[PDB]
Structures are given as structure tokens and as C-alpha cells.
Write a protein that binds this ligand. Structure first.
Ligand SMILES: *C(=O)[C@@H](CCCC#C)C(=O)O
Length: 408
């Protein structure tokens, strides 16, 4: 059952000291105090940790739904982020592309968080005409892998999760999306309106899927891979010094994999039999533009880097149908874009969506600038509750210096 339950007992307990060393001890002191004081309710400690202490430079948090849990976590507590900077840090949202979606994602947030519930409900209703079904079936019960609904489930999950973070007062200073995630970024930035984007993204997915072809993810930098392509092959994504993807017709991809295998290059065929970001899409570009022409495009009110150039999007690009056509046809320059995003703001990098695929690419590309990264929703196999994962994210954001992230 996905009946609304509201927020749990789950609370975030903040701790801040003036030394990394006083942090460890003060977290252990608080643990002893909770043991030796059965009067102390958990909600009073939480409120008191906010109102009665100054938010100092060295921070950590625990999440807990009860007192023994909080005590256990406070003993194991290790500072995890650097001391907060003197100016408040910038925040960036990283919005993943296809590949991480799964049935059941965000079902915990759907039942605890009314912004997440309402955003999902609204998107599901807008999408019924283009999709032919209720998206919430695909989100929470069952879905055909790689279907239109499966990818729309990811788009709406990213969008709902970002709205949920923004309602907590975590608003991004910059955005970057990977592939499909660039549409979520555009909706969040004000370039597109979510209600107009939803059916257009859906028809876009259908046109890409019906174009056939194949995509292979290669664990190597693009400079190593480029000489091996390939009539019938395009560089589909340049993701990090050890990650790129190649797309084209199936026979050409087969041949590339044989050559990669002869050179010891690790690779894996992506499950979706499509070839987004390659010449295979040429026959549907004009028809896709016709759908793009239904959108009211506006200049971004939150800055974002586009995968077309791997750089900040201009107002002229954001509002241009042919640029959005380029976004679908051309290499996703994510490695360049994450470096452009980092050089300007040095922001906290917050992955908005299931898993940690963009976080790993950011860490590989930004080595060793020491980026602070925050993950926001679990992988398909993880046993953690969605609301626990979210509470941890918000605590960690507060520990990095994003004060509005602490709930209550
Ligand atoms: C990247 O995320 C691509 C996903 C295509 C899936 C289909 C069909 C994209 O360009 O959206």
C-alpha cells in the first residue's frame, strides 16, 4: 500500500564544535548524556541542538527514529565533510540520465513527503494523455524495462525529488543534467514548464526507442576510444577520464566490442537497445523539433551547463529549438560540463535521482580538487529506507554549511 503516512519519527541531530577533535568528543558526550537521562526525549534533544547551540565550523549529524539508534550512531560518528567555509557554499544539482531507474524508486518519499507525493500526482495526471497509462503504476508497481513509462518514471522522480529538496530550503545555485537529466534541469531552471515538457519528453523517448541501434559503455577515456570508431558509430557521451559511451547500429557496435575485447578495454553493452546521441537518430530529428516547437522556452533563472557544449547555457541556446535538437543528436559532454560547473562555483554537488552515477564521474573528473558530494536516493538493491537516505543527505548538507538544509 502507498497510502500517505506523513513524516516519521526520523530526526536529524546536529553537532558542531570548533575543532575536528572537539566534534568527536562532543558527539560522544551527547551519547553518554542520552544513555544516562531517560527523561530526555529525542524530539527535545533535536530542538535543543538547534536553538541552544551555535552552529560552529566543524559539523556532523546523525539520523535517528529513537534514542538507542541515536546513541549508537553518535558513538560511530566520524566527521565526514571539511569545516564549513567562511562564505556559505554554493549548491549544484546533478540530474542523472537513463540507466538508474527501477520499480519502487521514491516509494518511501511518496508516502512520507507531501511535496513529493503532490509533484508525482500532478505529473502523473498531466502525462496520462501522452503516456496512455497512470505513471504511478510504472513508478511503484511494475513496468516494462526500457519502455516510455520506465524513462518517464525517472524524469518525474528527479523532478519530484528536486522540488522536495527546494521546499526544505535547499535551492540550487546551478544545475547540470546528463542526457535526459538535462530536461529536468531545464524545468527546474525555468527554461521549460514541467506540464508542457512532460508529454514532449514522452514522445521524444518513443522516437528515440523506435530508431533502434545499440549503445556500449566503455571504461576508458574518449581519446583512447575515438581511433576505434567506426563508420556507423558515434561518441554518445564523454563522461570522465575512465568513462565514455558509443552508440550506432548494432552490427558496428558488435565489431567495436570485438576490437575493445582484443585490446583489453573493459566495456558493457547498455541494456536499452537504442542509440541516443548518434547518427541513428537523424531520421526523427525534424519530427522531434515539431514537438519541441510546442514548448514555451524562457531564459534560465537558475544557471545550468548543457551537455551540447559542456559549458554554461546561453539564453540564446536555452530558447532555441535547434539547440535542443542538438542536445538529442550530439555527444553528451558531461566531463567538460562538470569541470565548467566546478571551476566557477566550487559548489557542493548534490545528485538528484537514484544512485551515484554522476557522483562517481564528478569525483573522477574533479580529482583531486576535493569536491563535496551528496547522494539523495538509493540504488535499486539498497536496503535503506528512502526517508533515511534523504535525512542523511540533508544532515550532510547542513554539515557542509548549507544551513537551510537542517529540518524542523
Ligand atoms: C539519455 O539519458 C538519453 C536516454 C534515452 C532513452 C530512450 C529512448 C536521452 O537522450 O534522453
Amino acid at each position: 500500500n502507498l497510502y500517505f503516512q506523513g513524516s516519521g519519527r526520523r530526526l536529524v541531530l546536529p553537532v558542531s564544535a570548533r575543532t575536528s577533535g572537539a566534534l568527536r568528543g562532543q558527539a560522544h558526550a551527547l551519547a553518554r548524556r542520552l544513555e544516562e537521562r531517560p527523561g530526555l526525549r529525542l524530539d527535545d534533544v533535536a530542538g535543543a541542538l538547534r536553538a541552544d547551540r551555535p552552529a560552529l565550523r566543524h559539523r556532523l549529524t546523525v539520523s535517528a527514529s529513537s534514542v538507542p539508534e541515536a546513541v549508537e550512531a553518535l558513538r560511530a560518528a566520524v566527521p565526514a565533510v571539511p569545516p564549513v567555509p567562511d562564505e556559505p557554499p554554493k549548491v549544484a544539482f546533478l540530474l542523472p540520465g537513463g540507466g538508474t531507474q527501477y520499480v519502487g524508486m521514491g516509494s518511501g518519499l511518496y508516502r512520507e513527503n507531501d511535496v513529493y507525493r503532490d509533484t508525482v500526482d500532478r505529473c502523473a495526471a498531466v502525462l496520462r494523455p501522452a503516456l496512455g497509462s497512470d505513471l504511478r503504476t510504472a513508478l511503484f508497481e511494475e513496468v516494462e524495462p526500457g519502455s516510455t513509462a520506465a524513462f518517464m518514471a525517472l524524469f518525474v522522480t528527479e523532478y519530484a525529488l528536486a522540488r522536495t529538496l527546494m521546499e526544505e530550503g535547499v535551492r540550487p545555485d546551478a544545475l547540470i543534467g546528463h542526457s535526459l537529466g538535462e530536461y529536468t534541469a531545464a524545468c527546474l531552471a525555468g527554461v521549460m514548464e514541467i506540464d508542457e515538457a512532460l508529454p514532449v519528453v514522452a514522445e521524444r523517448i518513443r522516437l528515440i526507442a523506435s530508431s533502434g541501434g545499440a549503445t556500449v559503455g566503455v571504461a576508458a577515456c574518449a581519446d583512447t576510444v575515438l581511433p576505434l570508431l567506426g563508420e556507423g558509430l558515434s561518441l554518445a557521451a564523454v563522461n570522465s577520464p575512465v568513462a565514455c559511451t558509443v552508440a550506432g547500429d548494432t552490427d558496428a557496435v558488435d565489431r567495436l566490442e570485438a576490437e575493445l575485447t582484443r585490446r583489453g578495454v573493459p566495456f558493457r553493452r547498455l541494456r536499452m537497445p537504442a542509440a541516443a546521441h548518434s547518427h541513428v537518430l537523424d531520421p526523427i530529428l525534424e519530427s522531434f523539433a515539431g514537438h519541441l516547437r510546442t514548448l514555451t522556452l524562457r531564459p534560465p533563472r537558475i544557471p545550468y551547463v548543457t551537455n551540447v557544449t559542456g559549458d554554461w547555457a546561453t539564453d540564446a541556446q536555452a530558447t532555441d529549438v535547434g539547440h535542443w535538437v542538438d542536445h538529442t543528436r550530439r555527444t553528451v559532454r558531461f566531463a567538460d560540463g562538470i569541470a565548467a560547473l566546478w571551476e566557477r562555483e566550487r559548489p557542493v554537488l548534490v545528485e538528484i535521482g537514484p544512485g551515484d552515477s554522476l557522483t562517481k564521474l564528478a569525483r573522477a573528473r574533479l580529482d583531486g580538487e576535493g569536491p563535496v558530494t551528496v547522494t539523495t536516493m538509493r540504488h535499486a538493491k539498497a536496503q535503506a529506507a528512502d526517508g533515511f537516505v534523504l535525512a542523511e543527505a540533508l544532515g550532510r548538507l547542513w554539515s557542509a554549511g548549507v544551513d537551510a538544509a537542517l529540518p524542523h
